């Protein structure tokens with residue numbers, strides 16, 4: 394149970410910590426009433442700029458693995474095409490064995506980053522954070538945010554909503570892309586579905 398804090402998600406006031414529905418019904422982005430209201434301030438990412446990726450919550454489930462992906466759709470649906478720009482294998486959204494202190498609203502002390510690479514054209518996108526928790530039920534977490542790319546790829550991995558991950562491991566994505574980061578404990582890294 395975690396949510397993305399930066400970049401600021403769509404409709405943050407109605408966005409909870411829960412994973413995607415196990416039946417796939419609310420993929421992508423936790424579909425619900427008024428799910429795609431932009432935050433007030435524009436999130437601007439210059440090509441090549443190191444951008445923050447940060448989280449809220451204490452139920453870190455021993456970490457796991459995450460992707461950062463972009464689509465041109467501003468109200469994503471099941472038909473949206475995603476482009477993975479970063480994979481984090483292990484230690485996302487935290488490198489601890491289990492859960493952390495502080496309740497549902499605590500800023501997660503482990504912080505991350507992403508960079509818009511040269512092959513992404515300036516324009517408006519939706520950015521998705523996806524997360525496959527290491528410990529607990531086999532879930533997929535997902536939050537989405539509007540971003541504007543200014544001047545200054547693999548498809549997104551989907552599982553746990555026939556492709557089912559193994560409890561206890563930090564998964565390694567089949568096609569993680571050319572920007573892959575390992576932030577976890579070597580003993581938990583997958584020797585994906």
Ligand SMILES: *[C@@H]1O[C@H](CO)[C@@H](O)[C@H](O)[C@H]1NC(C)=O
Pocket residue numbers: 443504505506574576
């Ligand atoms: C982005 O985060 C990774 C993982 O902590 C770190 O290794 C890297 O140095 C960071 N990049 C920066 C701060 O430019």
Ligand SMILES: [Cu+2]
Pocket residue numbers: 394395452454
């Ligand atoms: Cu949880």
